[PDB]
Amino acid sequence: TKVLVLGGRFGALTAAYTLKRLVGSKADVKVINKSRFSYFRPALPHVAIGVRDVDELKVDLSEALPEKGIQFQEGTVEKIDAKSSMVYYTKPDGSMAEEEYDYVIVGIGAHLATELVKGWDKYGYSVCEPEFATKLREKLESFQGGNIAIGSGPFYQGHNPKPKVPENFVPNADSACEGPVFEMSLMLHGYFKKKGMLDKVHVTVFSPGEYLSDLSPNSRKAVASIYNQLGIKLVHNFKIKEIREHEIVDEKGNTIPADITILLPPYTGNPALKNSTPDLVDDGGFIPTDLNMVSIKYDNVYAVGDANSMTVPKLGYLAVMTGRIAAQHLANRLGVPTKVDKYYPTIVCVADNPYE
Amino acid sequence: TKVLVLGGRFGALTAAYTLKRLVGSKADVKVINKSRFSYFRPALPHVAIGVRDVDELKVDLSEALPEKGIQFQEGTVEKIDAKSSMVYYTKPDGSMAEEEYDYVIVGIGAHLATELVKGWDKYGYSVCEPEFATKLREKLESFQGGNIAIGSGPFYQGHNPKPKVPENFVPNADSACEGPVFEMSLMLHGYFKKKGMLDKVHVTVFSPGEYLSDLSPNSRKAVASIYNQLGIKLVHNFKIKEIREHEIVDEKGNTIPADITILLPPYTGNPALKNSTPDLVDDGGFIPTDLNMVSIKYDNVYAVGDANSMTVPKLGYLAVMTGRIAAQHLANRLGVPTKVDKYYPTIVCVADNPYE
Ligand SMILES: *Cc1cc2c(cc1C)nc1c(=O)[nH]c(=O)nc-1n2C[C@H](O)[C@H](O)[C@H](O)COP(=O)(O)OP(=O)(O)OC[C@H]1O[C@@H](n2cnc3c(N)ncnc32)[C@H](O)[C@@H]1O
């Protein structure tokens, strides 16, 4: 039995390791990732005064994986042909390979559509880009004063076909990961407060839809009250279209002053999935599955983490959860009786609570 | 300067210790508590198979306090005369005393109105009573099968006068502490599942109002979906009036089958506060204050924790937060310049998230 695991982070690594440990030699587990190394840092930076806390885990998939009985091949997936059970990918040398599988576990995540933001190239500061968070660190340090805009881009969620899960297990969100925006807004305030710059710095928070939609209206009004107290402005229904040197523009031509723009780019499906068997994916480019992580159309395709339709918000712990379930269910299929954990929707993002 | 601190738990102890450490000899800090000992266990029990995890902190206020420069007097407060700045209390020997204060910090919490529940005496199982949680442990162990009802009583929240705080800082809730209900329902399911009793045991969860009101409607529907998957019934708008041997009755005559009733009693104001200077307290029996924890009517009265109007939900960490703010603000008043922390509403209970 040959099992291909696509990607190299939360969803992929969890599924690979979990699967190999469960079935051992009953299957060949091979991982295909677009890069040799996978990095794991802290979600949000440590904006402290004169104190920079570096902390990253750097995994070499080529050495870390074989060490566990898992083969590794570096390559960029271009599409999956679910009908013939083939994965097409470009190898480092530029050559195009097409390999077949008995089972595939898709963990290549989603896509941060920075390309949908005019001026991102020249003026953007991303919170989700590796060392892009270093460029921000420096700018925030040398900042004399002015306007700061922090927020996220729209979530191009897919809707059809629908995952085969219980009702209300998948929320509809305008933003894929909004919690980090709240936390960062509070941090930026504390940082500038410690520098006696509250009067020189003006923070605006923007949301593609209603801010923190998992909360009740009162809880949302309460968050708005905190912002008001802290001197933070809130702009709802602002779908970013462009970033200029001193302002940001939405889809309707409206503007927000911003000398520094901190953006969580819009989320769209992974291009490789958009270019796969049309009926494997929904209209967003995500793979709808059942509670066992098995595609609703192809019984030998598993989707984990961000790549799966049901993971809303797009959380790393849901990635780990899904990666584990996919591996347990498959193990049972390969003749190794295993308990398959039950999937749960998150209900609410704990970062909504300021005491967190 | 004489500072009386009423009560002996989260709010009181935090304020006393914080105050004494900040002002030292600049003031006499005396604590008056209805008991000599204060116990601190874990919020929710550990219902494991064959594994009972005992873990409690037992504080002897008479020895622990003096050791920190804080005097201690055991007595049950009967009322506070804010006009004359007197605290009336009954001593253990039955005698009545009254001491004048320059400042008072009220940390006597609220009241669990079990008396409002007919049959509580003979058939109730409380989650908030010390060793009452031991009586439940045994019953749940010897349970052969049947119906279990778990939920909370209504919250008799006060509304006027209103705390002097920013808009939306105080939510209106039908339940004072509902999160523990969700967690316990999930635990009970896991416990009976491990005993292969899911078919023999039927759990119903009841709410005085909506069910986790800090969440959006979808998030609430999602929690309802989880219950449906787990075979747990949910009954909204059920304000408990009576407990019989095999069922519970609400205020409208409706019933829920229950051979075991696990209830978080209704919350009402502390009787001693209901019997105090009428204009010190709101219509619920709680003390409305500003963000510094100072009463809106008497500038030398502080309210912390559950006793304060703004603490909704009624959380121990909000008690600690308020206890600390009251102490810092007072210290400044006593000539010891101190930073006064900013109070924040909780926004959402993290227990709403099943992955928590
Ligand atoms: C951006 C962010 C995310 C976040 C967060 C804060 C920020 C700023 N805070 C979080 C938190 O507090 N708690 C939590 O649980 N999650 C939090 N998140 C989200 C987390 O980053 C994501 O949910 C998580 O990373 C999802 O993991 P998944 O494993 O599903 O996906 P991924 O990390 O994007 O990894 C993708 C892997 O696939 C490889 N890849 C991508 N495309 C290809 C192609 N074409 N071919 C081959 N491999 C591919 C990537 O290289 C990567 O290895």
Ligand SMILES: *Cc1cc2c(cc1C)nc1c(=O)[nH]c(=O)nc-1n2C[C@H](O)[C@H](O)[C@H](O)COP(=O)(O)OP(=O)(O)OC[C@H]1O[C@@H](n2cnc3c(N)ncnc32)[C@H](O)[C@@H]1O
């Ligand atoms: C019941 C409960 C509470 C709870 C929880 C789960 C359960 C089942 N889980 C929590 C959680 O996960 N996180 C959290 O932060 N809080 C949680 N809670 C709530 C917590 O129990 C309360 O919010 C907290 O106890 C509030 O503390 P506070 O100090 O404000 O009040 P208190 O603990 O009731 O203490 C009252 C003290 O005052 C004395 N007292 C009472 N009446 C008198 C009179 N008349 N005279 C003198 N002293 C009096 C009491 O003896 C006690 O010392």
